[PDB]
Amino acid sequence: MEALKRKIEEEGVVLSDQVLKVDSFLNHQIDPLLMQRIGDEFASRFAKDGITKIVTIESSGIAPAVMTGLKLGVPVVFARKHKSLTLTDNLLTASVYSFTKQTESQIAVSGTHLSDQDHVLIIDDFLANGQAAHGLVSIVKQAGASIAGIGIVIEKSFQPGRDELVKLGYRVESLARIQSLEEGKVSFVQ
Amino acid sequence: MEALKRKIEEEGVVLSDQVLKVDSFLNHQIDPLLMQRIGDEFASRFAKDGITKIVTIESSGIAPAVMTGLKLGVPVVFARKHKSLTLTDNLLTASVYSFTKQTESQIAVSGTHLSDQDHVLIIDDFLANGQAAHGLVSIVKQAGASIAGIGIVIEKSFQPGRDELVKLGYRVESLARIQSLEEGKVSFVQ
């Protein structure tokens, strides 16, 4: 999206050659209109895939995912952080290593919100090493649901996440693909 | 909001005398259409208040706040969990005791996303004891901004939150008001 690309160029802040900060419009402060466009762009790409539900992870993935679900007319389920001490009957879980925090946590979704008849569209804000995406894929398959694809708002093409993810055979749609972050500048994939 | 009250009646699950679960459409799985209606209702109520920004807290408040922001045409800033062990200046913080998790945590907002020029609409999913609301109000005042009011999706009128905020001179707009959760049933305020 030229709209997303421009937002990144003028508002994004290059933390290092490995991290891009977009707190002004995606990760802390949210630009609703831009989110609507993002959701519409995602819906367009999966319009005829027969998606029945969208799955994301709290909390940055929520806005993009909700707008997408609004356009496609399907519910949105967001995975939540978990680790608690008790018996959670029918709870889909997965271990995810945070790329930005370098810590490991467990994400989860109540089994009751996903069924083997669901054809899911996974959505998330960033794609780096692919940990979060794999985690989501794992949760969806645990419910016996099928996966129509993976929508990413910003993908760092220079990181292994993308290549490792497409190995599974799931269609990966990244709205903005960054080739480099070197020299405090964002260069998109040509 | 009749549409919201019906959702609560048919899908809401009374957990205890103090907690209502609505994981099927508001807190885990999200119903986008309903979120949009909720967003428009809030926007309608504050249509002429001169709102410049919305402030909420991750993660359940995000969806209702974003739709409100889309309708009103303003940005949405969501407070995030923060380690009192961290630093970062200009950072606006508050201490919130989670009604449902029953644990204390620090929430924070980058001071760059709020200015004394702002006129804020605070939004959250539930109102119980007023803990989260008090945290957002503190953060907003820390930035020197003014407050139009607090939009709440589901209020438990039988708990102290609303009375406390009202007594403090804050406008409270709750779309659904519950008078009691006793006997495992939802009874709205008449």
Ligand SMILES: Nc1nc2c(ncn2[C@@H]2O[C@H](COP(=O)(O)O)[C@@H](O)[C@H]2O)c(=O)[nH]1
């Ligand atoms: N803000 C921001 N978050 C990132 C960036 N790269 C990765 N992440 C965070 O890390 C997760 C993606 O990492 P991955 O699972 O792909 O290894 C996302 O949930 C996201 O919050 C980045 O450049 N900027």
Ligand SMILES: Nc1nc2c(ncn2[C@@H]2O[C@H](COP(=O)(O)O)[C@@H](O)[C@H]2O)c(=O)[nH]1
């Ligand atoms: N799902 C759910 N969350 C609640 C309920 N009561 C309080 N909360 C949670 O607690 C916060 C409100 O509590 P308060 O800050 O007003 O004491 C909200 O952010 C919400 O996540 C409830 O009955 N059901």
